[PDB]
Amino acid sequence: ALLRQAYSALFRRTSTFALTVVLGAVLFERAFDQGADAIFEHLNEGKLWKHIKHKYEAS
Amino acid sequence: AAKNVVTQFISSLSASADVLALSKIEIKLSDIPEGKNVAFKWRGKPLFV
Amino acid sequence: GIHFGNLARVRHIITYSLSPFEQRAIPNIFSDALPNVWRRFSSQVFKVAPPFLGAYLLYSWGTQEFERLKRKNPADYEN
Amino acid sequence: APNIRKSHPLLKMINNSLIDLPAPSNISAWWNFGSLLAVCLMTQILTGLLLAMHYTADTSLAFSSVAHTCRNVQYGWLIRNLHANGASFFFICIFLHIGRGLYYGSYLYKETWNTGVILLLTLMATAFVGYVLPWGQMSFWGATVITNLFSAIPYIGHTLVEWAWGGFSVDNPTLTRFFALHFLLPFAIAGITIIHLTFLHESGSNNPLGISSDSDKIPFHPYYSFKDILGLTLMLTPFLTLALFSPNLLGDPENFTPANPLVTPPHIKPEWYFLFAYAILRSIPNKLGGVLALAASVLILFLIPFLHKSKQRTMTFRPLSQTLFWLLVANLLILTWIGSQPVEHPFIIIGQMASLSYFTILLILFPTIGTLENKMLNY
Amino acid sequence: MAPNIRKSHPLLKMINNSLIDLPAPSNISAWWNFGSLLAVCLMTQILTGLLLAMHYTADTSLAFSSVAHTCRNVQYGWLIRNLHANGASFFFICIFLHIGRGLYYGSYLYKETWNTGVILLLTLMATAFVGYVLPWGQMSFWGATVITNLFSAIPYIGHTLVEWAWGGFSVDNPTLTRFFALHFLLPFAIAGITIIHLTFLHESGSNNPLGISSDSDKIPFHPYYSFKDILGLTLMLTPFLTLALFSPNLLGDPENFTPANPLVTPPHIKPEWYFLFAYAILRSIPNKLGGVLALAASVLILFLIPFLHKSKQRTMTFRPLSQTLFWLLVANLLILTWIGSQPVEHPFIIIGQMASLSYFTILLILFPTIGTLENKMLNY
Amino acid sequence: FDYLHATAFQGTALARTVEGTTENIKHLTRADLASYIDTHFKAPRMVLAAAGGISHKELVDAARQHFSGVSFTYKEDAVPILPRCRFTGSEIRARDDALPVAHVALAVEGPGWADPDNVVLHVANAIIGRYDRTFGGGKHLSSRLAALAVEHKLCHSFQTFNTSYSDTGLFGFHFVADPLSIDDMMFCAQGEWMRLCTSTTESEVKRAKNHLRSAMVAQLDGTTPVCETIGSHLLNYGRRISLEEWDSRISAVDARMVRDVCSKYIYDKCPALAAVGPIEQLLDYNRIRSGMYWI
Ligand code: HEM
Ligand code: HEM
Ligand code: HEM
Ligand code: HEM
Ligand SMILES: COC(=O)CNC(=O)CCC/C=C\NC(=O)c1ccc(Cc2ccc(I)cc2)cc1
Ligand SMILES: COC(=O)CNC(=O)CCC/C=C\NC(=O)c1ccc(Cc2ccc(I)cc2)cc1
């Protein structure tokens, strides 16, 4: 059972509870950022400098 | 949320954006006779020639 | 700074309650929750809304009457 | 000895006023604003310093420094936003925190209340000076009208103003000393807030039913600490939603034009939280009258405690009073609106009325309904 | 209920519970006065401070000039600066005895009351530092440039920490304005911690010159000490006014009458007197880090004094040995100061070096050692 | 202790008073009494125990003669297994500020007669032991809680208990205190409990052992108690446990053992709470729950 395994190896020992929020948040950020950035850069396709960039970036 | 708001506020202190770019300066090695030193207002701090 | 113990004199009252872990987060959202959320709304909308509505009206009138007084009345130019 | 949470001359305090604090098992959400107001204060002060670290109080650079702060400082712009609006969110919260008190008669805790009033008065003043720092067109003309208010007092009148401006008309000396003022006042608020809360702790919190609660109290923690963290996030959402999605909704745009001591703008309105006052000052057509009406329009709060006639404490059980209370609220909503409008018909008359009705509901309709009510219970 | 309205009023009770009925050793001397003076000192700096801040303009291109306009054009402005400028000193003077008083009579055994004290000192020190830069004079600058640069001694977060400080890549406007913010704020923090300081003290009562219980005889602060203090205040106020009225610039460097020039560091550079001993020590060790460290510890050592107490008695009154050693330390300090006043050259360099060693040594080894020996000579 | 049961096992059968209800005792009938005897007092569920200067044979012989009445169907040789009793974290507070002192009792679900862990548990319960006003021990007692209890006038008395049953059991402690010390006390206790789960030392247990050891020996002080040990042993453990055994089982226990077991049964478990008296100073299940972890 995930919740049990969860409660046993994580949410129990106050020491590891914390250690989780840390390594946890970490992933969350990394992931969240990507999403929102994507959900955003997507809702504004072809309007961001990141999209227009190649029309002048001599390469 | 907290980690980001602190980052945000904290970089509010570091250098602004109106902090200029590079140098390049004019100097005639004949304006410095044999045996002397001179100060030039260079990129913020002095420059000895 | 201690207030717990010197409060008041109470006699013969039994209370029973259960650990949070033994009971539900939020229970009876439909058989008990909402039906009460309503009651409340019902009993109070008749003391509250009245004067608010009363304002709304006055606001529109005042506003409508003002925008009206800005327009021009022909009876001053038919001469 | 025993635990290090009740014998530590410091730790004991955070525990004697924030954890073991006995609270009515039943205070609602209208009791939350207390904290929010606090979190609000401490928060303004932070954005405040951060800001003050880039502003430059001097007519010839005030405006431009604020822009540079927005445009060139890392997240500066955001930092202003939060400060600029926090002020509103602040006034909002304080407003309910006052209504909560009126309805449930917390005003019977006189000292805890009176301080409150002083606090309001200071916040009001505080925002006034802050607003002038950006040295915009309003900033100026606001700074010019408000201070001028004291010129209504005879003799020491015209003369008192001089200190204020530090001149014979608003100029640099005014700006710089306002910046000083603004920097200082908040702290005074934080200070009086301490007295405010400290007075409250002699009596315990009031409660929605208006009757003894000793018969059942609960530790602020975790009952209200949790209730509050939630309350905070429920109010924080809209305030962020504005300061992130519609920064200038609540703000006049005229103040995007550098002060010009030569041209007072045509469409002049103070920021929302001062409109009701504005309306009243504008209701009476006399320098002094308007001022006085104004002065009392707020100073009246000191009286509320002596205008309580009901045998019960809260309105929960007095429908009559209740209707009169909501009539007062709405009455206020109008006054505000009226302030948003120019001096013309119908507005002038509407304003005039609403004021009369404001003062009257407080000075006569509440004490009168209050008594009547008792006799209808047979007391 | 309660009879009189001086013990039941949740406010009035305080001024009466901490300033009137407050029990005090019937015998505290004059070295106990500095406490109040320090408070009156603070409360006073803050006044002259606001008054001043109401005319200053934190911005390199107008900093200097604003202060002069304040002196020259503001009604009594000049006086108001003087009082502020020197109050700082009077302030440091007072604080210095207030510490010595503590060392001699071992008040340091009231650990919390003491540790706060140290934090307080630290803040005051930092406070004056920022205040001094505002006038944007030559020292102001080069001072602001050297002192902040001190954090650049820490490795890794070093060079980088500095950046926040200056708000740039070298001292400039951003530094000045944020320093004004700092200076405006800190005092209040001092006033706040002073509340903790005093509040901790009130759990134990004041120490006393004989270093023995005093319960056997205490007296109300009022009027015994309220009166003793009003007098103390006027006895110190005289010289401090005498300077700020008859010799305004005695204690002040004149080099700072020349607008900051980021291009020329003056030849004869020495900090305001209250920082000389530090200065001397930082200058004693010929190594970036060593100097810093020695410095860091030259003050941070105060935190140790409480754990370096070995005598069975509390005050020195009854320990001639310790006493001599104590005065040796004082004088030792005096020298270090003087040494800071002098340039890096012989003999000075060597003299400085010694005096430092001797400072640290008297505190870390001679006090604890004499302290013990002493006990054995009483047969304990 | 009844209320403790009444809410600890609430809703089940264990959660009833032994003396039974007021209504029942007013209406029970010759009939009903009969059945109880008939339905319950049956040989496969009864034990003839005795101790003294008696010969085993000589004893059984008598049995054979009066406890006859052999059975036919397998039904009669069957021990009706009982329905499990659900433990429920909760509290029941009976207030009366008119009482001189207040009694509080806290507990977790026990392991049940069989479990070899009950040994460890009792070893633990010995570490905290018990205290009471008259104890000449005083501030020097070895029980941390006893010591604190004395130092700060925490309570008139307190005690640890390990009530065991066929399938379950209660494990905790009960103390009596003044209305103005219930708190401090409660607190010190919940702490000692934690200490158990986190830092019990080899000394703390060495003593505890030797104590338990001689406590069990005094359980066999005379004929009646020796007998009771047999009556109860057979009926619960299903045989007789010799002191030689009990002892060995104790010599086994060490710190590590205790720490794990107590964590196993105490750490972060919703407790059963029962308070009686002028109990205002103690006031929160949550807060108490919160005291079930870290320390
Ligand atoms: C910066 C100003 C203020 C802050 C931060 C503040 C904060 C608080 C806090 C923390 C509480 C306790 C919790 C609560 O009941 O909400 C409180 C209570 C109270 N405040 Fe304020 N307050 C402020 C202004 C005022 C004002 C302007 C008034 C009205 C004149 C006021 C009147 C009261 C009263 C009557 C209570 C009693 C609460 C009760 O009825 O139980 N406060 N305040
Ligand atoms: C007491 C709570 C506070 C309130 C109610 C408040 C309100 C305001 C207001 C109304 C403005 C004008 C905002 C605008 O330009 O739209 C402002 C500006 C300013 N405030 Fe505050 N403020 C508070 C505290 C402080 C504090 C504590 C500081 C720091 C000492 C501070 C620093 C500033 C600065 C630098 C400005 C000018 C820059 C700007 O306008 O963005 N404020 N404040
Ligand atoms: C702004 C900072 C300070 C102020 C305004 C201040 C004020 C006071 C006051 C009012 C007293 C009580 C009267 C007296 O004994 O003089 C006191 C006591 C004391 N302070 Fe400070 N203090 C300050 C800094 C410090 C510092 C820097 C130290 C030394 C690290 C310190 C150590 C003590 C101690 C040990 C006492 C105990 C007095 C005794 O021996 O009876 N204080 N302080
Ligand atoms: C904490 C006690 C205080 C100390 C130790 C102190 C010290 C100083 C120092 C060393 C200077 C430089 C004086 C000079 O130019 O010779 C100064 C300047 C200044 N301080 Fe303070 N100050 C204190 C508090 C304050 C406060 C509370 C304010 C007001 C918030 C203030 C405002 C100023 C201003 C405007 C200046 C610049 C003008 C000038 O240099 O005269 N000071 N202060
Ligand atoms: C936030 O700041 C502002 O809104 C100030 N700006 C303006 O008012 C801009 C327009 C200026 C013109 C007229 N203002 C008024 O007549 C006016 C009158 C009363 C008040 C309330 C108030 C009184 C004293 C005090 I002290 C404070 C408040 C506020 C404004
Ligand atoms: C009053 O201000 C001054 O005297 C500052 N001005 C100067 O120091 C002028 C000369 C600048 C050059 C060198 N200064 C130093 O080396 C110097 C070294 C240590 C200190 C003490 C001190 C440390 C941290 C801290 I934070 C504070 C103090 C102070 C100054």
Ligand SMILES: CCCCCCCCO[C@@H]1O[C@H](CO)[C@@H](O)[C@H](O)[C@H]1O
């Ligand atoms: C409860 C309110 C939580 C607010 C969390 C918002 C976090 C702010 O998020 C910010 O978004 C920017 C734009 O993508 C990024 O560039 C920043 O690095 C990031 O910190």
